[PDB]
């Protein structure tokens, strides 16, 4: 489906080039060319968005699989610090 | 998890390539507007906002992966650190004698 | 849907950049100008 | 644990080095622009400066933590020796 | 998932105490100057 | 334990040497720039650290001296009394 | 034990001599308060040495 979507966008480009050639001939269709280009651009945006979402989903799923004493030390250090400071104290 | 990291880095490089594109087309839109103009202005403004968005994604993801690494390292080390500290867990007489 | 809910849930700002002082940047502008001045 | 502390220190130092280097380039950038460009360069280098300041503080904290481990061993030895002093003087 | 982030944040705030460090004279600065 | 304490004492001495070295660097910076308050604050912080480590080393040395003296004096003033 | 105490007092006189050197260093630096403080420290070390010598004499008496 993705490959055929790319091919159909290429077909939209072909129709657009044919339509601009026809418009040049008529000057010597613009609405049709505009809508063909809009179709191509919308499908391009769709494929870009889906690719971005798929890559984001894959990487975030991998990272989500990846992600899937204080009291004693503080008290002893504080009291010992106080006592040793009192020791050093020559006041 | 290493695969997650590599995939995130690859997607980030994809974002960077997209930003390089965006700035390129911004260049061509500026040139096209000068050669012409309002439509080129529209498209270059869209390009500029897209560039800002991709830059924001880049910076946010870099900060996020940095947080990942810092938190992982700190959490891993602290467990053993606190296990170690858990395993770890005359004054008057001198004064009198000198005098 | 579920994809969007994953995005919103895993934003985790506390994990990632979760204040500014215009006065500091202004005084640093002035300092740079004085240096050049 | 010690090895991962050393590795985190090396990572933190490399991140710092990148930060102040970047800040130097952005300082040159702000100087060369010097008003809106000056604002932008100052904002960017200020983000880098804040990053560098938290990095400096974090390095201080981790070094203090390692020193705290060593001093914890030291005070364990000291309290052992001063228990020995307790018993002998008693 | 979320609980991991919350607990790492709690541990960081608990261990980020300046009490590990100094944690606490301009006149003396001026005198030495 | 005695060897551990001796190694810790040597480590503290090296720490003090580095602290006085960086304090000297900061103070010479301050002198050059006065030829200032910010560098004075920095060197003062480093000076607080240096004198702190000096106190630690002095206390540890006096501590090992005190334990050896405690053994010896226990013996002696026991003999006297 | 007598030898151990003699070595300890020798260490005390070593401390006292280094303190004397440091006091002279302070004198010469001044010539070119801290000296008084370090002289007090020297007095502490000297007093420790003197007490150690006195108890050494007491040991010599008692053991003999």
Residue numbers in the entry:
A (entry chain A): 17 to 44, 68 to 107, 124 to 146
B (entry chain F): 14 to 49, 58 to 110, 128 to 137
C (entry chain K): 133 to 150, 154 to 172
D (entry chain G): 17 to 50, 55 to 110
E (entry chain D): 128 to 151, 156 to 164
F (entry chain H): 17 to 51, 58 to 103
G (entry chain I): 17 to 48, 63 to 94
Authors' text:
Individual ESCRT-III proteins are small and have a simple set of α helices (α1 to α5) that define the functional core of the protein.
While this interface differs from the reported interaction site of CHMP1B (A-type) with membranes, it is similar to the membrane binding interface of Snf7 (B-type) and CHMP2A-CHMP3 (A-type). The conformational differences between the membrane-bound and unbound polymers may be influenced by the distinct interactions therein, underscoring the adaptability of the ESCRT-IIIB protofilament.
